[PDB]
Amino acid sequence: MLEQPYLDLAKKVLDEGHFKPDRTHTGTYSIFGHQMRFDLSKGFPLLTTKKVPFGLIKSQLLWFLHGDTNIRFLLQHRNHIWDEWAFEKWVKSDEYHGPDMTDFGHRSQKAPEFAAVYHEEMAKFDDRVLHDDAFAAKYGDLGLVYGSQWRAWHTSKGDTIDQLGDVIEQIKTHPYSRRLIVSAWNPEDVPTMALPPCHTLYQFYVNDGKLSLQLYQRSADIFLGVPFNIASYALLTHLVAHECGLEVGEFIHTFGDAHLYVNHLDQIKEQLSRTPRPAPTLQLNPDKHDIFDFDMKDIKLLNYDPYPAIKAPVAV
Amino acid sequence: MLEQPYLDLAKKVLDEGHFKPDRTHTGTYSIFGHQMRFDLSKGFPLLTTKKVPFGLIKSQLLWFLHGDTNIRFLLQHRNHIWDEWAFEKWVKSDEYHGPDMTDFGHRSQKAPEFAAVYHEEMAKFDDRVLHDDAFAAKYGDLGLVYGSQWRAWHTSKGDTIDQLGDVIEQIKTHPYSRRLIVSAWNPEDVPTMALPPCHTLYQFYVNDGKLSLQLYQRSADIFLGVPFNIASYALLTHLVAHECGLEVGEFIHTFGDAHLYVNHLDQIKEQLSRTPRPAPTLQLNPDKHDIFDFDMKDIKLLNYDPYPAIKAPVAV
Ligand SMILES: O=c1ccn([C@H]2C[C@H](O)[C@@H](COP(=O)(O)O)O2)c(=O)[nH]1
Numbered sequence: 216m217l218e219q220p221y222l223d224l225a226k227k228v229l230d231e232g233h234f235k236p237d238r239t240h241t242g243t244y245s246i247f248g249h250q251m252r253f254d255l256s257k258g259f260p261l262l263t264t265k266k267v268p269f270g271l272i273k274s275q276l277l278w279f280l281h282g283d284t285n286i287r288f289l290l291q292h293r294n295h296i297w298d299e300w301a302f303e304k305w306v307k308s309d310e311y312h313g314p315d316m317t318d319f320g321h322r323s324q325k326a327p328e329f330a331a332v333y334h335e336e337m338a339k340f341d342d343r344v345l346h347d348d349a350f351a352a353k354y355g356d357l358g359l360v361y362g363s364q365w366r367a368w369h370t371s372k373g374d375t376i377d378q379l380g381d382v383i384e385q386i387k388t389h390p391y392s393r394r395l396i397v398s399a400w401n402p403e404d405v406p407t408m409a410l411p412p413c414h415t416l417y418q419f420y421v422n423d424g425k426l427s428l429q430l431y432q433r434s435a436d437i438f439l440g441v442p443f444n445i446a447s448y449a450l451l452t453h454l455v456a457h458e459c460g461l462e463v464g465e466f467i468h469t470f471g472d473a474h475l476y477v478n479h480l481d482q483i484k485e486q487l488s489r490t491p492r493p494a495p496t497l498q499l500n501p502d503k504h505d506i507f508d509f510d511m512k513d514i515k516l517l518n519y520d521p522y523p524a525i526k527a528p529v530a531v
Numbered sequence: 532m533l534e535q536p537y538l539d540l541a542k543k544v545l546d547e548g549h550f551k552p553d554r555t556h557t558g559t560y561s562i563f564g565h566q567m568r569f570d571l572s573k574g575f576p577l578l579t580t581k582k583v584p585f586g587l588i589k590s591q592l593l594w595f596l597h598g599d600t601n602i603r604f605l606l607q608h609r610n611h612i613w614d615e616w617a618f619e620k621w622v623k624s625d626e627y628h629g630p631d632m633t634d635f636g637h638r639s640q641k642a643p644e645f646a647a648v649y650h651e652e653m654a655k656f657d658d659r660v661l662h663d664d665a666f667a668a669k670y671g672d673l674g675l676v677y678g679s680q681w682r683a684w685h686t687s688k689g690d691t692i693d694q695l696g697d698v699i700e701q702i703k704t705h706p707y708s709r710r711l712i713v714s715a716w717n718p719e720d721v722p723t724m725a726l727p728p729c730h731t732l733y734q735f736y737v738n739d740g741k742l743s744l745q746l747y748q749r750s751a752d753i754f755l756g757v758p759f760n761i762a763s764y765a766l767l768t769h770l771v772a773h774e775c776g777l778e779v780g781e782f783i784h785t786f787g788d789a790h791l792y793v794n795h796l797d798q799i800k801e802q803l804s805r806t807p808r809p810a811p812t813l814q815l816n817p818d819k820h821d822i823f824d825f826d827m828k829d830i831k832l833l834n835y836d837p838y839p840a841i842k843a844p845v846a847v
Pocket residue numbers: 238410411413433434435436437439440441444709710
């Protein structure tokens with residue numbers, strides 16, 4: 216069934232995970248090393264067993280794909296997923312006069328006089344990102360994040376490389392190429408950076424007329440991250456294919472540490488008794504062909520008939 | 532048994548490979564995506580089923596590990612594995628007066644008046660690498676190759692980063708770190724380069740007191756490459772561990788295209804009936820602890836009791 220590769224990792228991390236210390240203290244149980252394969256000529260791997268808002272995914276992606284590094288695109292479609300990374304530097308900055316805010320994170324997460332200040336503070340900022348074309352430019356422009364490592368990797372002497380646009384075309388003119396990779400691991404930018412990307416490298420492969428994509432993820436949160444990460448790159452494998460005029464093949468997700476923090480066991484547990492349902496189908500717009508100009512309505516999912524969603528404590 | 536993960540990929544590529552066109556024309560049968568796991572606390576994965584000269588491996592490695600890019604180190608221990616990359620630029624150069632030599636490769640491989648000229652021409656050059664401290668410096672120094680992408684990744688404005696030395700120490704001071712990666716994929720140097728590395732990325736992981744290493748290989752030659760590539764990174768996982776004072780855990784080898792060219796079927800076929808034998812053990816010198824100062828005799832293998840080797844047509 217489509218998403219069974221997922222439910223097999225959950226099960227499998229539970230069953231032979233091993234307690235590991237971590238970035239917070241919230242242990243995780245993890246495994247090192249793992250591949251799971253999705254025949255995308257079968258349905259869209261959106262998890263049926265937990266409600267997943269496609270909406271946040273495809274726009275997160277179209278922001279990647281336009282070469283973007285700016286919050287504003289996301290807030291313009293109430294996709295809040297990165298705000299924290301951007302509110303962070305506003306708060307810790309010298310225009311920011313206003314409450315102490317020193318790493319909210321979890322200071323919010325179990326303290327309510329302060330998990331309220333932060334809220335509007337944050338919405339204060341969101342508003343200020345949308346509407347102030349100048350503020351947005353130094354506090355919303357986020358710096359290095361996937362849109363910028365895929366489509367404008369900075370060089371040694373000058374310039375900036377559109378790593379992805381180059382790869383799509385070496386898919387268009389050299390399909391049998393073992394050298395088709397897009398990387399986001401920039402070694403000079405890695406010591407001192409926020410989240411050194413989790414989606415480190417991907418690679419395409421063409422065989423007999425169908426595309427495929429592999430993902431190396433060096434770190435992963437089985438419950439919050441991976442259901443979303445799975446549709447992101449299977450959305451991408453689908454977009455890039457329509458562009459190259461190829462059929463769809465398989466999405467492969469290779470993991471380095473894959474992990475379940477511990478205040479989430481109870482939740483995965485519950486999800487694991489839900490009997491998966493048939494998977495959604497994805498129609499991509501029949502006329503637009505450069506994918507970089509894509510927009511929301513050029514992509515609309517069908518039969519996603521999910522279970523209810525499940526709620527869960529998050530990161531720090 | 533140790534090397535059975537290997538013999539299962541051979542079998543498995545045969546059985547459901549799919550003919551793919553390629554760099555030469557020599558088809559390959561390949562698969563995209565594959566992980567195989569080796570519990571190194573069990574023995575050294577040198578293939579027992581085909582004789583494998585450890586010698587070339589450990590010195591190839593010590594050249595990587597000293598940050599080297601120079602032929603001479605290799606020729607000094609008759610490790611010829613890279614000569615071709617280096618003879619190439621001598622021949623195609625304007626000191627080189629002497630025969631036409633235009634990509635030997637296969638012009639040697641089925642033409643004997645010329646698979647002789649080349650031979651001494653090449654030995655002419657080898658000699659000239661050893662003994663001419665100046666020639667060696669512009670024709671033996673190879674440019675970008677693993678010793679240089681691991682230990683001196685060039686930066687944007689200036690400098691050069693010892694990516695590996697940094698990672699070993701974040702193993703020494705931050706063991707539970709999902710961010711421990713060494714990459715060799717340099718995106719700016721990749722369009723115009725010889726062999727964009729095949730061993731793209733690796734990642735370490737510590738759990739409960741034992742190290743592990745994963746390899747992403749975007750391309751692979753099941754018969755010639757992978758038996759060697761397997762001992763290289765399991766040698767490395769072993770060296771880096773002795774340095775961090777850790778036990779040994781697992782080596783994971785994740786493949787992108789994994790492939791068998793077609794004038795090699797017959798050979799793997801034969802090897803696949805050989806009944807694997809017990810695996811060798813590896814003792815590393817008990818006193819030296821910085822691994823970067825290691826040398827040949829600080830590493831000596833035990834009980835490698837291999838089958839005979841098997842001969843095979845090579846690359847182009
Ligand atoms: O798309 C994503 C992004 C992040 N994570 C998780 C991985 C870890 O749970 C945490 C990152 O912490 P580090 O790996 O950077 O230490 O976020 C995911 O699983 N999927």
